[PDB]
Amino acid sequence: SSMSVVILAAGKGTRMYSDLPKVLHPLAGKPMVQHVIDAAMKLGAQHVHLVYGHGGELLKKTLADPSLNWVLQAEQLGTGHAMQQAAPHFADDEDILMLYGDVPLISVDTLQRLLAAKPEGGIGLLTVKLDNPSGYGRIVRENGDVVGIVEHKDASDAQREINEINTGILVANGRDLKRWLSLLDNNQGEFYITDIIALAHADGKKIATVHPTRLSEVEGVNNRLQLSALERVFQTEQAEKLLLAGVMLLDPSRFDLRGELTHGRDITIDTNVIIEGHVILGDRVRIGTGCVLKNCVIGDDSEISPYTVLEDARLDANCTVGPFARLRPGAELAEGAHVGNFVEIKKARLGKGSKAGHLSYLGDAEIGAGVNIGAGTITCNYDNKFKTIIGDDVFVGSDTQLVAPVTVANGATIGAGTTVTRDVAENELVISRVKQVHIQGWKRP
Amino acid sequence: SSMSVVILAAGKGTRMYSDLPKVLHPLAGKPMVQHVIDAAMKLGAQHVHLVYGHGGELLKKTLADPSLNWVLQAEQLGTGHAMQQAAPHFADDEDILMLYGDVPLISVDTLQRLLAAKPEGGIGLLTVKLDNPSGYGRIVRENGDVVGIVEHKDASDAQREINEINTGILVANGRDLKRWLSLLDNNQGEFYITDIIALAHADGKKIATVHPTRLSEVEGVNNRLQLSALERVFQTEQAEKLLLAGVMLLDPSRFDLRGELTHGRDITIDTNVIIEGHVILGDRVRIGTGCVLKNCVIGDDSEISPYTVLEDARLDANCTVGPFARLRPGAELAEGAHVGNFVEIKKARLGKGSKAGHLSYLGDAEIGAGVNIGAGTITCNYDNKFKTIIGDDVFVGSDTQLVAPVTVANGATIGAGTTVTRDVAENELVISRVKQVHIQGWKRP
Amino acid sequence: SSMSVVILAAGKGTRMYSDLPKVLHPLAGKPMVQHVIDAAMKLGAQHVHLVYGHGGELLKKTLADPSLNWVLQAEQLGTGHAMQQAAPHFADDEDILMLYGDVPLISVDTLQRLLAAKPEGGIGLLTVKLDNPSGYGRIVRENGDVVGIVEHKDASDAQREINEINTGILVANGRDLKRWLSLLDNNQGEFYITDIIALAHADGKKIATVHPTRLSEVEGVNNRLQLSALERVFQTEQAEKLLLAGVMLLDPSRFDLRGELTHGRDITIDTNVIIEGHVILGDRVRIGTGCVLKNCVIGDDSEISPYTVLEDARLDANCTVGPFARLRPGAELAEGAHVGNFVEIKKARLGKGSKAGHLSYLGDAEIGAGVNIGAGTITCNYDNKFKTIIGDDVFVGSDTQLVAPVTVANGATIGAGTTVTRDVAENELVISRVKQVHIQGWKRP
């Protein structure tokens, strides 16, 4: 069929104490409002209408999304008024679902039930019964029949016992909806969206209701404490989905996914790992404690040792990296390569079974197979930046500075503490050798 | 009005298995007993009387606090006996409140209710009703009127149903208190402080009661498991206060504050951050996972990357530091400065927009603006310690050792692998240049 | 008396999505099934019979344990059938207890109650009453008398109210057990082990029942989410045992023990520490945040600073190591030694009060007392591997490469940036000194 959504996101997030529009605040590293858009997209939402008051410019900025239909608003004067501003935008043949930019966790199932329990020429309304309903809108039924919503405000002591409350999420045909809207008053001073419930039982239509499966689906964010609770809920969910799909998390409450994780079989992730962007892990990969991976491919059987950071990096199968290793964009390890502690790799490839074990920096480097990069080796590659190249079976002594552009051919050997400015030939040894000078019985300060 | 406090802290913390007096054990990095003192100070407590048995010397030692009035005690023989030892110390015109050194979480509100519900010539008594009261002192009321306390010990099956129990915290006028005290017996062998309740209804005075708002306010520490529970409670509280005041914590259950955090607006703190001493963070600062900050000022818009440790360090605005960076006391970054991975800074300043990106140690250094500190640069500054100075626009090649005292003037350039013992002049290049020596077809061992 | 156990571990752990047999999956770093074996050993279990279907070879492989009696099985066709396969293996004079390889948390107390509540010529049966019993085997009693087990399957609406359920764990004499077994049918198609309950009330014997003290004792693992819950339970338990025995954990929910921890008095362990293998900590040791210790001895009063990794390493008293330090097998610190940030130690000893503060790698080294290892010092010890030796009171300048085999005698001093290939004599100074070369007004690229 046909269906569009409207996302309300116009209020003042005063209690966020922020210079950033509330709805742009991230949940698992992405704007609250994008979770809602994402969901709308998953419904088949043909169009998405976003209603905003202040924060306009950097809202549409921080949200590229050229596919969206933006809707300005005088200055927050009515949640119903807001719904009026987008009213002329609803095609009469399409359903119109209403969501809030600060309720990021609303599941598709719960909406794709709402859209099924909508009575022809009527409203599908999402509701939840509360433990303590001590301040929300009551759902007022007569014979279990929805007739209208009561604000906690004007609620008799008898009504205040009504557990079931309004999530503020609901459906209706675009035609019928255009109707019910601009037939409402302002006599708080504002216009309540609540009213279109009674103003629907008015002209004899039936308003049905489904419930969300989790309370968190309809949790609204007014402040950061609330947002952090939703972050935890969201992370527990992701973690449990990975556990059930075969990934071992040594402590799923100390795990964070902010993006996507594609994975193979029998992966172990230890405590306090964070996964950002899109990470692909092969079979039998092990990630130690404290590692941060962002936009990485890690090949079958690789081991990432504790406290290793990787971003836009690639490891083939059987590699080992860490502890205390830092791989930056362009870092590439060929099959069975090893990078050790206090080693940084930038736009560099370390070939098959090559080793860089300690205290080294490698950038803008093409290194071959079976190469030994001694402790303390530095590509001195900054003066743009220049390329260092090393063939197979090369031995690079400790504390060597490779001054690029420089090429060291296969089988070459480089003595410790050597500066290399000129190219090195196959199987040639090079030793930057001076003469250590001796004073006898020297009195140390 | 006038008011003093007494802190009881004399028992044997046997179940702590410690050589340190129980009350000195830290909660959020400060002695249990200091939390209690702190609170007393916040009441306006004119004097604080501290009653102790063993542990005396290093108690008054580990607690400088020359403002305190110490009170010795034979050898724990009566909680009431203890209260006798400080009795001659209470002015008749002042209220005397009683607290315990091992109940660190007692809030001011709860005490500044206790002090309001005190009946003239009578006791204000703190109480709590328990889920399971299966071992404490019962509050025995007649017509809801407090008449005396029953030890779980001698408690009829009927009494054992009394949910409400004694926290052991209470008030009373100093005069009246001196009275009720030394009129009690020793016929456990000890003197119970419990009794002064009935010995107050005795001479026809009214004993009122307020409750603490949280159970944790009256939780006593007898062991470390108990202390750890209170640590978590205390940390959750702090975390929620920062969230509500506008700081984003990516996981408030993996956050620890052991001191004070002054903050501006829109700060993000990722998982597993610890804050010690006094930390000042400006607007829009980001602290990555695993960072430890102790006594630091971080300027607006700075980014601290994961696994970075800072102590007594200062960053101006727009600085970036980490990952894997170590800043020690005296470390200072000017506006937009960058410190990278595996870099340590001690008593050194890195000027405007200067960079130290990798594998470097800088101590006792004054470095100017626009300076590039190549990978592997070391201030060789130990032989006391001597000063290294570098002007603006200097380029320092990788793996340079700067042997202090040495001065490198503006615009100078230093080739890679250079040892610098002598001063360098404006725009002068210096290259510690030897000659790499070549053996052909060398057989590597 | 006499007693043997049987561990059932033959099903398909399909929902583990693993190439590793379910029961081999680790809990606190050791195979689920080893926890069960361990427990059996603690009972005095004279023999342990392990029944398995597929996964056979690498089961008996990954479990050396030459003490075990393995029992093959056609192909999972009956949990009772399985129990038949080991039936001919039970001595008539011994008790036979039945356990499952995927229920790792079953305590000895609960089994050493089961073995006491066994009625002569009868069954001791472990049971638990459930909050929601909505899919398990009901315990069917008549006058509170166990008569037989009902599968949730064939269970009247009336029976489905029976809270109490079958853990599947039970006892019986080996003789009697051999009996009750091979008198059962296959008319699911399989043989139910359930039946021997009614087939015991059949020949007029009494089947008693004890309960486990914790629900987690009888939790079965079918998937990784379940296993992770048990991991957390197991870790909370260990943590609380260490807290009660006197170790301070700054956050027991961010602590992991995968092995054994021997400890002395007044130890503090900060957040996110992992303990693997066997770790011995002396009195008054402090372990900072993020440290990983595996098979280490740490002497009285040592301080391990944050983010330090140690494996098969030894520290005497008063040592300090970290932050950001990496100690590998063979790493040894003598009394009061210090290792700083970005320092790696392999098969090396750093003598009394010696210091290696920054950016160094030391392997295969014997270093004496009072030695100063400057920043950036590297043992260039790889060409097998060769030994570097340094006596007392030696000063090693920064960025020195020690090319082993080399010996530096007592009181010697080594200038910064020195390569050392030859031995150094007592109190001799050595400076690898070249000449820095100067270009005036050099235009930096």
Q: What DSSP letter does each residue of B87-153 carry, written as one string?
A: GGG--TTSEEEEEETT-TT--HHHHHHHTTS--SSS-EEEEEE-S--TTS-EEEESSS-EEEEE-ST
- Any CB–CB contact under 8 A between C274 and chain B? no
At residue A216, φ and ψ (nearest 5 deg) are: -70, -15
Count of beta carbons in the 10 Å neighbourhood of residue A279: 20
Closest-CA residue to A307 (of C298, C254, B323): B323
- Any CB–CB contact under 8 A between B18 and chain C? yes
B135 is in an annotated binding site: no
| Sheet (strand C413-414) strand order | A437-439, C429-431, C413-414, C395-396, C372-373, C355-358, C338-341, C320-321, C303-304, C286-287, C268-269, C248-249
Closest-CA residue to B375 (of A304, A365, C436, A390): A365
Q: Is the peptide bond before B323 cis (omega within 30 degrees of 0)?
A: yes
Which residues touch C336 (CB under 8 Å, ≥6 apart)?
C316, C317, C318, C319, C352, C353
Dmax of chain B from CA atoms? 109
Backbone dihedral region for residue A236 (phi beyond 0: left; psi -120 to 50: alpha; all else: beta): alpha
* Residue A358 a catalytic site member: yes
d(CA C118, CA B202): 60
Tokens in use for A363? 């950038």
- Any CB–CB contact under 8 A between C203 and chain B? no
Tokens in use for A121? 């020429």
- Positive or negative, the CA dihedral C112, C118, C120, C122 is negative
- Positive or negative, the CA dihedral A294, A320, C254, A251 is positive
Rg of chain C (C-alpha set): 31
Rg of chain B (C-alpha set): 31
- Can you name the CATH fold of B1-222? Spore Coat Polysaccharide Biosynthesis Protein SpsA; Chain A (3.90.550)
Q: Which helix (H) or strand (E) holds C41?
A: helix C32-43
d(CA A342, CA A361): 9
Q: Is the peptide bond before A21 cis (omega within 30 degrees of 0)?
A: no
Burial letters B158-168, b for 16+ CB under 10 A, else e: eeeebebbbbb
The single-letter code of the amino acid at A16 is: M
d(CA C415, CA B306): 35
Between the alpha carbon of residue A308 and those of residues A115, A287, B158, B357, C288, the distances in Å are 47, 9, 63, 17, 18
Contact criterion met (CB < 8 Å) for B376 and C398: no
Burial letters C340-379, b for 16+ CB under 10 A, else e: bbbbbbbbbbbbbbbbbbbbbbbbbbbbbbbbbbbbbbbb
Residues in A closer than 8 angstroms to B324, CB to CB, are 307, 309, 324, 326, 342
The single-letter code of the amino acid at B31 is: P
- Any CB–CB contact under 8 A between C389 and chain A? no
d(CA C317, CA C92): 57
d(CA C92, CA C84): 15
The single-letter code of the amino acid at A44 is: G
B354, B367 Cβ separation under 8 angstroms: yes
Closest-CA residue to B44 (of B6, B100, B8, B2): B2
B414, B430 Cβ separation under 8 angstroms: yes
Closest-CA residue to C325 (of B324, A372, A327, A360): B324
A58, A382, A407, best to mutate vs chain B, most B CBs in 10 Å: A382
Portions of chain B given CATH number 3.90.550.10:
1-222
> Tokens 């032989």 appear where?
B383
Q: How far is C343 from chain B (nearest CA, A)?
A: 10
3-state helix, strand, coil in chain C (%, to 5): 20, 30, 50
Q: Of how many residues is chain A composed?
A: 445
> Tokens 């989410």 appear where?
C225
B neighbour chains, 3+ CB pairs within 8 Å: A, C
Closest-CA residue to C223 (of B113, A247, A111, A197): A247
A221, A419, A426, best to mutate vs chain B, most B CBs in 10 Å: A419
Portions of chain C given CATH number 2.160.10.10:
223-445
Three-state DSSP class for B3? Answer: strand
Going by their DSSP bridges, the two strands A138-141 and A146-150 should be labelled as antiparallel
Tokens in use for A10? 């116009």
- Any CB–CB contact under 8 A between C386 and chain A? no
B410, B393 Cβ separation under 8 angstroms: yes
Residues in A closer than 8 angstroms to B270, CB to CB, are 274
Closest-CA residue to B56 (of B74, B80, B82): B74
Q: How was this structure determined?
A: X-ray
Q: Of how many residues is chain B composed?
A: 445
B375 is in an annotated binding site: yes
Resolution value, angstrom units:
2.5
Write out residues 82-141 of A within 8 Å (CB-CB) of B.
Answer: none
Count of beta carbons in the 10 Å neighbourhood of residue C187: 4
Residue of C nearest to B409 (CA): C441
Please list the alpha-helical segments (H only) found in A245-327: none
A132, A194 Cβ separation under 8 angstroms: no
At residue A2, φ and ψ (nearest 5 deg) are: -115, 140
The single-letter code of the amino acid at C259 is: G
d(CA C361, CA C350): 12
- Any CB–CB contact under 8 A between C252 and chain B? yes
Closest-CA residue to B247 (of A227, A105, A231): A227
d(CA A55, CA A96): 25
Between the alpha carbon of residue A151 and those of residues A98, A101, A144, A206, C93, the distances in Å are 19, 22, 19, 21, 76
Q: Which CATH superfamily is domain A223-445 in?
A: Hexapeptide repeat proteins (2.160.10.10)
Determine which one of B54, B89, B201, B358 is catalytic. Answer: B358
Q: How far is C248 from chain B (nearest CA, A)?
A: 6
DSSP string over A49-77: EEE-SSSHHHHHHH---TT-EEE--SSS-
Residues of C annotated as binding site for acetyl-CoA? Answer: 375, 381-382, 398, 416, 433
C31, C21 Cβ separation under 8 angstroms: no
Question: Where chain B is broken, by preceding residue (C–N > 2.5 Å)?
Answer: 187, 383
A151 is in an annotated binding site: yes
